[PDB]
Amino acid sequence: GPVQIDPYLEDSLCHICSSQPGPFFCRDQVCFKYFCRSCWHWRHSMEGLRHHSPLMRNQKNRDSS
Ligand SMILES: [Zn+2]
Ligand SMILES: [Zn+2]
């Protein structure tokens, strides 16, 4: 089938700006939500979350090395 997102996350709206869903995903137990470029920088600036990293939404590839 075609590329698509999982129903366990869906298009969750960015609660920081309240404008739209973010392109970057955070899998950390602290976040577990999407953020925009500016909202992501604001969220992860605080110490204790500086180990986080922006991921793609769902799998960008079914299988790889
Ligand atoms: Zn995070
Ligand atoms: Zn945002």
From Swiss-Prot:
Transmembrane segments: none annotated. It is found in: Cytoplasm; Nucleus; Cytoplasm, P-body; Cytoplasmic granule. Changing residue 44 to A: Abolishes stress granule assembly and correct localization in dcp1 bodies. Zn(2+) 1 binds at residues 14, 17, 36, 39. Phosphorylated on serine/threonine residues by AURKA within positions 166 and 197. Phosphorylation increases binding to RNA. Isoform 1 is expressed in immature oocytes, ovary, brain and heart. Isoform 2 is expressed in brain and heart. Isoform 3 and isoform 4 are expressed in brain. Expressed in breast tumors and several tumor cell lines. Zn(2+) 2 binds at residues 26, 31, 44, 52. The 2 RRM domains and the C-terminal region mediate interaction with CPE-containing RNA. The interdomain linker (411-429) acts as a hinge to fix the relative orientation of the 2 RRMs. The ZZ domain (509-566) coordinates 2 Zn ions and is probably implicated in mediating interactions with other proteins in addition to increasing the affinity of the RRMs for the CPEs. A continuous hydrophobic interface is formed between the 2 RRMs. Belongs to the RRM CPEB family. Interacts with kinesin, dynein, APLP1, APLP2, TENT2/GLD2 and APP. Both phosphorylated and non phosphorylated forms interact with APLP1. Interacts with TENT4B; the interaction is required for TENT4B-mediated translational control. Sequence-specific RNA-binding protein that regulates mRNA cytoplasmic polyadenylation and translation initiation during oocyte maturation, early development and at postsynapse sites of neurons. Binds to the cytoplasmic polyadenylation element (CPE), an uridine-rich sequence element (consensus sequence 5'-UUUUUAU-3') within the mRNA 3'-UTR. RNA binding results in a clear conformational change analogous to the Venus fly trap mechanism. This is Cytoplasmic polyadenylation element-binding protein 1. It comes from Homo sapiens (Human). The gene is CPEB1. The chain holds residues 504 to 566 of 566 of the full protein.
